[PDB]
Design a protein around this motif. Structure first.
Motif, PDB file in Angstrom:
ATOM      1  N   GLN A  50      -2.865  -2.619   0.658  1.00 40.05           N
ATOM      2  CA  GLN A  50      -2.558  -1.760   2.208  1.00 40.05           C
ATOM      3  C   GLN A  50      -2.730  -0.472   2.084  1.00 40.05           C
ATOM      4  N   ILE A  53      -5.412  -0.760   4.555  1.00 42.97           N
ATOM      5  CA  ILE A  53      -4.513  -0.880   6.250  1.00 42.97           C
ATOM      6  C   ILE A  53      -4.273   0.939   5.890  1.00 42.97           C
ATOM      7  N   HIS A  57      -6.937   1.570   8.779  1.00 44.54           N
ATOM      8  CA  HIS A  57      -6.223   1.792  10.388  1.00 44.54           C
ATOM      9  C   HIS A  57      -4.960   2.793  10.163  1.00 44.54           C
ATOM     10  N   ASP A  58      -5.212   3.543  10.244  1.00 49.47           N
ATOM     11  CA  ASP A  58      -4.059   4.851  10.567  1.00 49.47           C
ATOM     12  C   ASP A  58      -5.041   6.141  10.233  1.00 49.47           C
TER      13      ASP A  58
ATOM     14  N   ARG B  61       2.108  -8.174   8.014  1.00 49.79           N
ATOM     15  CA  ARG B  61       1.393  -7.535   6.496  1.00 49.79           C
ATOM     16  C   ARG B  61       0.163  -6.811   7.231  1.00 49.79           C
ATOM     17  N   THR B  62       0.306  -6.974   8.916  1.00 51.95           N
ATOM     18  CA  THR B  62      -1.369  -6.140   8.616  1.00 51.95           C
ATOM     19  C   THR B  62      -0.471  -4.453   9.451  1.00 51.95           C
ATOM     20  N   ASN B  63       0.546  -3.847   9.220  1.00 48.70           N
ATOM     21  CA  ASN B  63       1.329  -2.800   9.340  1.00 48.70           C
ATOM     22  C   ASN B  63       1.627  -2.586   7.706  1.00 48.70           C
ATOM     23  N   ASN B  64       1.518  -0.993   7.899  1.00 48.61           N
ATOM     24  CA  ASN B  64       2.321  -0.555   7.004  1.00 48.61           C
ATOM     25  C   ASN B  64       3.517  -0.264   6.643  1.00 48.61           C
TER      26      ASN B  64
END
Lengths: 65, 336
Positions: A50, A53, A57-58, B61-64
């Motif tokens: 997490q 991610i 990603h963010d 899963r891929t996003n938070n």
């Protein structure tokens, strides 16, 4: 070497690369800092996905394809 | 036509905790909100019959985000339009600039483009409900659009017909697949029985290739309608009775099946000829009994639905008054 020159802090918004969409490199460009593949290896070893991610990603380039 | 189809998709759930309180109701609501009234997988969704299968409300899963997703397989009612379908009600929004087009006014939304090449197409005027037949090209069901797209021309009964040759005797246990369709035509004929016979006669003689004002009515308990011409003094046979003969298991399916232009299209009657007694506009098609019987049944169902829709949509004599010019187009084209 002065601490005031070395330090750097950046928030969510700033210049981004045109090609990869990632933050521009370094403090001189007012962009973000780098999390190389060694940092990714360490985060993977800790099982921190997490966090990966959130950062790659963010905060970094991230898109719904 | 109206049919049952099964789709499978993935639905995103923004609030899984609230969604899971009434899973069935929330899933049905989401499916209705997303898919009803749109073209999907070459089909136009009309309503959602039910949810055949589903999956647990997973978490992305891929996003938070805490959002979830659910794989849902659902059975819905869809409308598919083939080539040569007849649409009784089509309003011409814009007949101008040497292009014509109209929107359907039935349970199956359609946007039909009518070419200006044909004079009959140019004659039609805006704001006028004009019956239309879709061209031989397939209907384009662009995903996400709220109405299908097609190309068509004002229905003018064409004199050229086709003759079908059956080389294989009646398929055994495929009579049930044909019976599925005889049920649909039976429902259509029951629906037609309700409306008045005079309007039905008016439209039938308007769209009968060989117009007959003799007022002679062929009477069949399922179907009643004005009679036509006789070719070689031959005797047609009712398709419904021949299908019912499936119990006997003998139906003489080999014989050439054909429906001449005189023979009323809505009428189940069709002529069976040992040889090519019917004049062959084109060499008799070499097709199995399955292909033929399905084809004839489809044609009669199309025409019966066309007639019911014509009677329903033109229920006002003043609307008929306005559309008598379209009627004149059809009548002028008619020959005999």
């Amino acid at each position: 070497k002065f601490v005031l020159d070395d330090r750097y802090a950046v928030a969510s918004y700033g210049p981004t690369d045109a090609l990869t969409g990632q933050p521009l490199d370094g403090k001189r460009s007012h962009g973000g800092l780098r999390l190389g593949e060694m940092e990714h290896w360490v985060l993977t070893a800790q099982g921190a996905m997490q966090t990966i991610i959130e950062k790659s990603h963010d905060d970094s380039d991230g898109c719904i394809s | 036509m109206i049919d049952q189809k099964i789709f499978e998709t993935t639905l995103n759930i923004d609030d899984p905790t609230n969604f899971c309180t009434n899973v069935e109701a929330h899933l049905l609501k989401e499916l209705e909100n997303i898919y009803v009234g749109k073209c999907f997988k070459n089909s136009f969704i009309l309503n959602i019959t039910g949810v055949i299968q589903r999956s647990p409300c997973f978490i992305m899963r891929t996003n938070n985000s805490g959002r979830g997703y659910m794989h849902v397989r659902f059975s819905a009612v869809v409308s598919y339009l083939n080539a040569f379908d007849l649409i009784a009600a089509v309003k011409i929004i814009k007949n101008d600039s040497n292009i014509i087009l109209g929107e359907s006014l039935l349970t199956e939304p359609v946007t039909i483009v009518i070419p200006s090449s044909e004079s009959q197409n140019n004659v039609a005027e805006v704001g006028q409900i004009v019956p239309v037949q879709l061209a031989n090209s397939s209907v384009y069901y662009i995903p996400g659009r709220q109405q299908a797209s097609a190309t068509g021309s004002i229905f003018i009964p064409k004199h050229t017909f086709s003759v079908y040759h059956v080389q294989e005797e009646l398929t055994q246990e495929q009579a049930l697949n044909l019976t599925k369709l005889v049920n649909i035509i039976e429902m259509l004929l029951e629906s037609r029985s309700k409306k008045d016979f005079k309007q039905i006669c008016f439209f039938e003689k308007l769209y009968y290739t060989y117009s007959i004002s003799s007022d002679e009515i062929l009477d069949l308990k399922i179907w009643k309608g004005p009679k036509g011409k006789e070719m070689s003094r031959l005797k047609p046979c009712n398709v419904l009775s021949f299908l019912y003969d499936a119990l006997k298991n003998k139906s003489s399916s080999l014989g050439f099946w054909a429906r001449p232009p005189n023979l009323l299209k809505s009428s189940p009657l069709a002529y069976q000829q040992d040889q090519n007694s019917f004049n062959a506009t084109e060499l008799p098609i070499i097709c199995s009994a399955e292909v033929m019987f399905v084809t004839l049944l489809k044609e009669i169902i199309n025409y019966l639905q066309f007639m019911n829709d014509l009677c329903d949509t033109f229920n006002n004599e003043q609307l008929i008054k306005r559309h008598e010019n379209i009627w004149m187009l059809i009548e002028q084209r008619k020959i005999g």
